[PDB]
């Protein structure tokens, strides 16, 4: 903990926007070990609650600082402080849904601060999300590589649905530090394994507890060309 | 090797179709250890060669039998024989390209037989592919889960390009056994790590040697809900 990003950190989060025309607002706080890549957060729907859609769709919008890093993979997010960073992302659901996010990450008074403006549209009325018939996400692997001076991430996720099925979705993310380009050491192509799980929920999902574990790493498989 | 799929197997491949209006035809053969998940193949462009596009785009179209499996993950492909299986896939490149494939997998005379009909369109004339300025693919992780009686796979890949950049692409695959549904044991949601590398190439890419290593597995990260 001898630095800006300490062994243990806390975070604050303010989310707002709409989904399928419905306005809402969320607030949350938590902590974790940025170096072990572990995270836990408590969130409350302070407005528009109870949401007419599944909270799951908002899961990945509520913390890149908390990602474990091995040797050989420079930390894009950690190197970004005190300034912080931002990122934009578009998620597309196979059944029609589109979820766009704009987030700001800063560090105020030793605490991490998250502001995310979100907009969702086209979620089928008889869809698992709007019908709130979802049951958490499966883990996933994010693919990342340097692009346009920033960091690009590509994601593919499967959301469990009532009955035993899955609802597919993919997204591309763009992460950008607020620090000079010739300052930090940009990482190369790599992956990040994620496992975001819902711990608790009550009051028609008006209060939510979630957890995430993420680890940066290279492909396990051996290369014949001596490539990473 | 005491069964249909032996410790060591060979394979035959006949590819044909077009890309951006250009017709071509490829033939190839190889072998590998289906259980160690290793593969090597030699391919020749018997028609339309030299191709006016990068061979890389055809890489993932040339062998699901060769995938290592741990305990807990039933083998969808191996369980499919002697009958065999098929699969369909659509790849979409971020710059406009679309590559559709239809493949048949059979087992004739102890040898694996591949027939794949492919169609590509919309590859930008000043694109890395048509300009043949690509430099192999990076490894990737395929996401898979049961759907509509068959197996669905989702993929995200990055193709290296001249200069130091990457060209993105994703695809969804549908795999279907030719054996009864109540016969084999359908696997659940899981992943497959892939690392497809180009070994050799000559004669303006008219002859190509490639290798693949694939392993089925569950997410490495621990779950708090006791989920796989």
């Amino acid at each position: 903990m001898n630095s800006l990003i300490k062994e243990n950190m806390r975070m604050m989060v303010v989310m707002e926007g709409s989904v399928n025309g419905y306005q809402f607002k969320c607030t949350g706080e938590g902590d974790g070990n940025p170096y072990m890549g572990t995270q836990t957060m408590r969130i409350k729907v302070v407005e528009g609650g109870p949401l007419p859609f599944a909270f799951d769709i908002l899961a990945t919008s509520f913390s890149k600082t908390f990602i474990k890093h091995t040797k050989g993979i420079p930390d894009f997010f950690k190197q970004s402080f005190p300034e912080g960073f931002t990122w934009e992302r578009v998620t597309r659901y196979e059944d029609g849904g589109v979820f766009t996010v704009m987030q700001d990450t800063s560090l105020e008074d030793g605490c991490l601060v998250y502001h995310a403006k979100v907009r969702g549209v086209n979620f089928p009325s008889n869809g698992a999300v709007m019908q709130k018939k979802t049951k958490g996400w499966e883990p996933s692997t994010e693919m990342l590589y340097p692009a346009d001076g920033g960091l690009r991430g590509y994601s593919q996720m499967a959301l469990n649905v009532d009955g035993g099925g899955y609802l597919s979705c993919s997204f591309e993310t763009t992460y950008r530090s607020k620090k000079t380009v010739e300052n930090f050491k940009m990482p190369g192509f790599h992956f990040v394994d994620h496992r975001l799980e819902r711990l608790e929920e009550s009051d028609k999902e008006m209060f939510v507890v979630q957890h995430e574990h993420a680890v940066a790493k290279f492909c396990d498989l051996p290369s014949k060309l001596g490539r990473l």
Side-chain angles (χ1 to χ4, degrees), chain A residues 113-140:
Chain A
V113 172
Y114 302 162
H115 161 40
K117 188 100 42 80
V118 322
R119 172 179 157 105
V121 306
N122 292 352
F123 285 79
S125 2
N126 304 310
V129 175
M130 301 310 283
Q131 282 298 347
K132 280 177 251 53
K133 302 236 238 4
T134 78
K135 301 171 139 161
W137 292 94
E138 298 279 4
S140 78

mmCIF file of all heavy atoms in Angstrom, chain A residues 113-140:
data_model
loop_
_atom_site.group_PDB
_atom_site.id
_atom_site.type_symbol
_atom_site.label_atom_id
_atom_site.label_comp_id
_atom_site.label_asym_id
_atom_site.label_seq_id
_atom_site.Cartn_x
_atom_site.Cartn_y
_atom_site.Cartn_z
ATOM 1 N N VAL A 113 -13.287 7.311 -7.446
ATOM 2 C CA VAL A 113 -14.593 7.880 -7.761
ATOM 3 C C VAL A 113 -15.057 7.523 -9.173
ATOM 4 O O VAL A 113 -14.364 7.792 -10.151
ATOM 5 C CB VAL A 113 -14.595 9.404 -7.534
ATOM 6 C CG1 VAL A 113 -15.880 10.026 -8.055
ATOM 7 C CG2 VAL A 113 -14.397 9.717 -6.058
ATOM 8 N N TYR A 114 -16.244 6.931 -9.273
ATOM 9 C CA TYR A 114 -16.779 6.538 -10.575
ATOM 10 C C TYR A 114 -18.039 7.302 -10.965
ATOM 11 O O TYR A 114 -19.027 7.285 -10.237
ATOM 12 C CB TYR A 114 -17.099 5.036 -10.595
ATOM 13 C CG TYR A 114 -15.934 4.124 -10.286
ATOM 14 C CD1 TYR A 114 -16.149 2.802 -9.898
ATOM 15 C CD2 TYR A 114 -14.623 4.567 -10.407
ATOM 16 C CE1 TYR A 114 -15.084 1.956 -9.612
ATOM 17 C CE2 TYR A 114 -13.555 3.726 -10.142
ATOM 18 C CZ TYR A 114 -13.791 2.424 -9.739
ATOM 19 O OH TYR A 114 -12.733 1.589 -9.472
ATOM 20 N N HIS A 115 -18.017 7.918 -12.144
ATOM 21 C CA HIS A 115 -19.201 8.572 -12.687
ATOM 22 C C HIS A 115 -19.470 7.950 -14.050
ATOM 23 O O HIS A 115 -18.625 8.001 -14.940
ATOM 24 C CB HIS A 115 -19.025 10.082 -12.845
ATOM 25 C CG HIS A 115 -20.017 10.697 -13.785
ATOM 26 N ND1 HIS A 115 -21.343 10.316 -13.820
ATOM 27 C CD2 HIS A 115 -19.867 11.619 -14.767
ATOM 28 C CE1 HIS A 115 -21.970 10.990 -14.767
ATOM 29 N NE2 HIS A 115 -21.098 11.792 -15.355
ATOM 30 N N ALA A 116 -20.630 7.323 -14.199
ATOM 31 C CA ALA A 116 -20.962 6.663 -15.451
ATOM 32 C C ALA A 116 -22.320 7.084 -15.993
ATOM 33 O O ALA A 116 -23.335 6.954 -15.317
ATOM 34 C CB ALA A 116 -20.900 5.144 -15.285
ATOM 35 N N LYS A 117 -22.321 7.583 -17.223
ATOM 36 C CA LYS A 117 -23.545 7.979 -17.902
ATOM 37 C C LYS A 117 -23.885 6.842 -18.856
ATOM 38 O O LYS A 117 -23.079 6.493 -19.716
ATOM 39 C CB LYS A 117 -23.319 9.273 -18.693
ATOM 40 C CG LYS A 117 -24.592 9.876 -19.272
ATOM 41 C CD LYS A 117 -25.106 11.021 -18.408
ATOM 42 C CE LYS A 117 -23.967 11.911 -17.925
ATOM 43 N NZ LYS A 117 -23.520 12.887 -18.964
ATOM 44 N N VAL A 118 -25.056 6.238 -18.677
ATOM 45 C CA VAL A 118 -25.461 5.109 -19.505
ATOM 46 C C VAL A 118 -26.762 5.345 -20.268
ATOM 47 O O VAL A 118 -27.653 6.055 -19.805
ATOM 48 C CB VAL A 118 -25.572 3.818 -18.672
ATOM 49 C CG1 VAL A 118 -24.463 3.752 -17.637
ATOM 50 C CG2 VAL A 118 -26.936 3.744 -18.003
ATOM 51 N N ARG A 119 -26.864 4.702 -21.427
ATOM 52 C CA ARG A 119 -28.056 4.777 -22.252
ATOM 53 C C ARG A 119 -28.326 3.432 -22.920
ATOM 54 O O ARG A 119 -27.490 2.913 -23.662
ATOM 55 C CB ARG A 119 -27.928 5.867 -23.316
ATOM 56 C CG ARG A 119 -29.065 5.847 -24.331
ATOM 57 C CD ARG A 119 -28.914 6.956 -25.360
ATOM 58 N NE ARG A 119 -29.631 6.650 -26.594
ATOM 59 C CZ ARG A 119 -30.777 7.219 -26.954
ATOM 60 N NH1 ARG A 119 -31.351 8.119 -26.165
ATOM 61 N NH2 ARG A 119 -31.350 6.888 -28.105
ATOM 62 N N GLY A 120 -29.502 2.878 -22.656
ATOM 63 C CA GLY A 120 -29.905 1.616 -23.236
ATOM 64 C C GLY A 120 -31.159 1.800 -24.067
ATOM 65 O O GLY A 120 -32.024 2.607 -23.725
ATOM 66 N N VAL A 121 -31.258 1.056 -25.163
ATOM 67 C CA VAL A 121 -32.423 1.134 -26.045
ATOM 68 C C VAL A 121 -32.665 -0.209 -26.725
ATOM 69 O O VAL A 121 -31.761 -1.031 -26.827
ATOM 70 C CB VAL A 121 -32.241 2.224 -27.134
ATOM 71 C CG1 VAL A 121 -31.889 3.578 -26.512
ATOM 72 C CG2 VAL A 121 -31.175 1.792 -28.143
ATOM 73 N N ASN A 122 -33.879 -0.401 -27.230
ATOM 74 C CA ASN A 122 -34.218 -1.589 -28.007
ATOM 75 C C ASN A 122 -34.249 -2.944 -27.298
ATOM 76 O O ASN A 122 -34.169 -3.986 -27.950
ATOM 77 C CB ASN A 122 -33.343 -1.671 -29.262
ATOM 78 C CG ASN A 122 -33.655 -0.574 -30.261
ATOM 79 O OD1 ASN A 122 -34.623 0.168 -30.103
ATOM 80 N ND2 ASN A 122 -32.830 -0.466 -31.297
ATOM 81 N N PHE A 123 -34.393 -2.948 -25.980
ATOM 82 C CA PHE A 123 -34.498 -4.220 -25.274
ATOM 83 C C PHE A 123 -35.926 -4.724 -25.463
ATOM 84 O O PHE A 123 -36.880 -4.087 -25.019
ATOM 85 C CB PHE A 123 -34.158 -4.068 -23.791
ATOM 86 C CG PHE A 123 -32.686 -3.908 -23.525
ATOM 87 C CD1 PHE A 123 -32.062 -2.678 -23.709
ATOM 88 C CD2 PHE A 123 -31.919 -4.990 -23.120
ATOM 89 C CE1 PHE A 123 -30.707 -2.530 -23.475
ATOM 90 C CE2 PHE A 123 -30.565 -4.850 -22.879
ATOM 91 C CZ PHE A 123 -29.955 -3.619 -23.059
ATOM 92 N N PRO A 124 -36.092 -5.840 -26.193
ATOM 93 C CA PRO A 124 -37.410 -6.418 -26.480
ATOM 94 C C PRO A 124 -38.283 -6.474 -25.235
ATOM 95 O O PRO A 124 -37.827 -6.902 -24.169
ATOM 96 C CB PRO A 124 -37.080 -7.841 -26.961
ATOM 97 C CG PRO A 124 -35.612 -8.030 -26.722
ATOM 98 C CD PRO A 124 -35.001 -6.675 -26.715
ATOM 99 N N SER A 125 -39.530 -6.021 -25.372
ATOM 100 C CA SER A 125 -40.480 -5.990 -24.263
ATOM 101 C C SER A 125 -40.714 -7.377 -23.680
ATOM 102 O O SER A 125 -40.934 -7.528 -22.478
ATOM 103 C CB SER A 125 -41.806 -5.376 -24.706
ATOM 104 O OG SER A 125 -41.775 -5.037 -26.082
ATOM 105 N N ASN A 126 -40.669 -8.388 -24.539
ATOM 106 C CA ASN A 126 -40.850 -9.764 -24.105
ATOM 107 C C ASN A 126 -39.489 -10.440 -24.030
ATOM 108 O O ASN A 126 -39.361 -11.633 -24.313
ATOM 109 C CB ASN A 126 -41.761 -10.518 -25.073
ATOM 110 C CG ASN A 126 -43.102 -9.838 -25.256
ATOM 111 O OD1 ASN A 126 -43.778 -9.495 -24.283
ATOM 112 N ND2 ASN A 126 -43.488 -9.622 -26.511
ATOM 113 N N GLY A 127 -38.472 -9.665 -23.669
ATOM 114 C CA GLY A 127 -37.116 -10.167 -23.557
ATOM 115 C C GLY A 127 -36.764 -10.488 -22.120
ATOM 116 O O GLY A 127 -37.390 -9.973 -21.196
ATOM 117 N N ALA A 128 -35.758 -11.337 -21.932
ATOM 118 C CA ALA A 128 -35.326 -11.737 -20.597
ATOM 119 C C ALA A 128 -34.996 -10.547 -19.705
ATOM 120 O O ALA A 128 -35.262 -10.570 -18.504
ATOM 121 C CB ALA A 128 -34.140 -12.687 -20.676
ATOM 122 N N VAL A 129 -34.408 -9.511 -20.291
ATOM 123 C CA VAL A 129 -34.025 -8.330 -19.523
ATOM 124 C C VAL A 129 -35.227 -7.533 -19.031
ATOM 125 O O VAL A 129 -35.405 -7.349 -17.828
ATOM 126 C CB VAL A 129 -33.011 -7.456 -20.287
ATOM 127 C CG1 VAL A 129 -32.727 -6.167 -19.525
ATOM 128 C CG2 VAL A 129 -31.721 -8.237 -20.537
ATOM 129 N N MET A 130 -36.055 -7.071 -19.963
ATOM 130 C CA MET A 130 -37.244 -6.291 -19.617
ATOM 131 C C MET A 130 -38.234 -7.109 -18.792
ATOM 132 O O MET A 130 -38.983 -6.567 -17.980
ATOM 133 C CB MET A 130 -37.914 -5.756 -20.882
ATOM 134 C CG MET A 130 -37.000 -4.875 -21.721
ATOM 135 S SD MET A 130 -36.185 -3.595 -20.732
ATOM 136 C CE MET A 130 -37.527 -2.417 -20.525
ATOM 137 N N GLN A 131 -38.225 -8.420 -18.998
ATOM 138 C CA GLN A 131 -39.090 -9.314 -18.238
ATOM 139 C C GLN A 131 -38.388 -9.656 -16.925
ATOM 140 O O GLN A 131 -38.947 -10.337 -16.062
ATOM 141 C CB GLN A 131 -39.360 -10.595 -19.032
ATOM 142 C CG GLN A 131 -40.399 -10.442 -20.137
ATOM 143 C CD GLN A 131 -41.769 -10.066 -19.606
ATOM 144 O OE1 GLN A 131 -42.027 -10.146 -18.406
ATOM 145 N NE2 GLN A 131 -42.657 -9.649 -20.500
ATOM 146 N N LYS A 132 -37.157 -9.170 -16.785
ATOM 147 C CA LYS A 132 -36.346 -9.425 -15.599
ATOM 148 C C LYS A 132 -36.326 -10.911 -15.268
ATOM 149 O O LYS A 132 -36.651 -11.318 -14.149
ATOM 150 C CB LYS A 132 -36.846 -8.608 -14.405
ATOM 151 C CG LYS A 132 -36.387 -7.155 -14.417
ATOM 152 C CD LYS A 132 -36.968 -6.379 -13.247
ATOM 153 C CE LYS A 132 -38.027 -5.390 -13.706
ATOM 154 N NZ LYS A 132 -39.084 -6.022 -14.544
ATOM 155 N N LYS A 133 -35.958 -11.712 -16.262
ATOM 156 C CA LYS A 133 -35.878 -13.158 -16.115
ATOM 157 C C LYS A 133 -34.437 -13.615 -16.319
ATOM 158 O O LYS A 133 -34.188 -14.647 -16.940
ATOM 159 C CB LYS A 133 -36.786 -13.851 -17.140
ATOM 160 C CG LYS A 133 -38.254 -13.457 -17.042
ATOM 161 C CD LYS A 133 -39.143 -14.675 -16.853
ATOM 162 C CE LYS A 133 -40.183 -14.775 -17.956
ATOM 163 N NZ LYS A 133 -40.004 -13.712 -18.982
ATOM 164 N N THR A 134 -33.494 -12.829 -15.808
ATOM 165 C CA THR A 134 -32.076 -13.147 -15.922
ATOM 166 C C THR A 134 -31.548 -13.732 -14.609
ATOM 167 O O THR A 134 -32.120 -13.496 -13.543
ATOM 168 C CB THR A 134 -31.263 -11.919 -16.370
ATOM 169 O OG1 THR A 134 -31.068 -11.039 -15.258
ATOM 170 C CG2 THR A 134 -31.992 -11.174 -17.477
ATOM 171 N N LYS A 135 -30.460 -14.496 -14.686
ATOM 172 C CA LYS A 135 -29.896 -15.125 -13.494
ATOM 173 C C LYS A 135 -28.370 -15.047 -13.398
ATOM 174 O O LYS A 135 -27.703 -16.069 -13.230
ATOM 175 C CB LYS A 135 -30.345 -16.588 -13.403
ATOM 176 C CG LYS A 135 -31.854 -16.787 -13.343
ATOM 177 C CD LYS A 135 -32.212 -18.262 -13.475
ATOM 178 C CE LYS A 135 -33.333 -18.654 -12.522
ATOM 179 N NZ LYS A 135 -33.991 -19.927 -12.933
ATOM 180 N N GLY A 136 -27.820 -13.841 -13.488
ATOM 181 C CA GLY A 136 -26.384 -13.654 -13.391
ATOM 182 C C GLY A 136 -25.616 -13.993 -14.657
ATOM 183 O O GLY A 136 -26.128 -14.667 -15.552
ATOM 184 N N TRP A 137 -24.371 -13.527 -14.719
ATOM 185 C CA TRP A 137 -23.503 -13.739 -15.875
ATOM 186 C C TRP A 137 -22.528 -14.885 -15.628
ATOM 187 O O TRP A 137 -22.194 -15.191 -14.482
ATOM 188 C CB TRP A 137 -22.666 -12.476 -16.132
ATOM 189 C CG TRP A 137 -23.446 -11.284 -16.592
ATOM 190 C CD1 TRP A 137 -23.957 -10.282 -15.813
ATOM 191 C CD2 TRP A 137 -23.749 -10.934 -17.948
ATOM 192 N NE1 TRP A 137 -24.596 -9.351 -16.604
ATOM 193 C CE2 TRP A 137 -24.481 -9.729 -17.915
ATOM 194 C CE3 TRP A 137 -23.508 -11.546 -19.182
ATOM 195 C CZ2 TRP A 137 -24.966 -9.120 -19.069
ATOM 196 C CZ3 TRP A 137 -23.976 -10.930 -20.331
ATOM 197 C CH2 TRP A 137 -24.706 -9.734 -20.265
ATOM 198 N N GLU A 138 -22.030 -15.472 -16.715
ATOM 199 C CA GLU A 138 -21.006 -16.505 -16.633
ATOM 200 C C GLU A 138 -19.679 -15.758 -16.700
ATOM 201 O O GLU A 138 -19.630 -14.612 -17.151
ATOM 202 C CB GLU A 138 -21.095 -17.450 -17.836
ATOM 203 C CG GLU A 138 -22.408 -18.206 -17.943
ATOM 204 C CD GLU A 138 -22.458 -19.423 -17.046
ATOM 205 O OE1 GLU A 138 -21.494 -19.643 -16.280
ATOM 206 O OE2 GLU A 138 -23.456 -20.170 -17.115
ATOM 207 N N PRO A 139 -18.589 -16.391 -16.250
ATOM 208 C CA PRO A 139 -17.315 -15.667 -16.363
ATOM 209 C C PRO A 139 -16.976 -15.442 -17.828
ATOM 210 O O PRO A 139 -17.602 -16.028 -18.714
ATOM 211 C CB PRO A 139 -16.301 -16.642 -15.752
ATOM 212 C CG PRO A 139 -16.909 -17.996 -15.951
ATOM 213 C CD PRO A 139 -18.399 -17.793 -15.829
ATOM 214 N N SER A 140 -15.963 -14.621 -18.085
ATOM 215 C CA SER A 140 -15.544 -14.351 -19.459
ATOM 216 C C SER A 140 -14.098 -13.867 -19.547
ATOM 217 O O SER A 140 -13.483 -13.503 -18.545
ATOM 218 C CB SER A 140 -16.479 -13.337 -20.123
ATOM 219 O OG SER A 140 -16.188 -12.023 -19.690
#
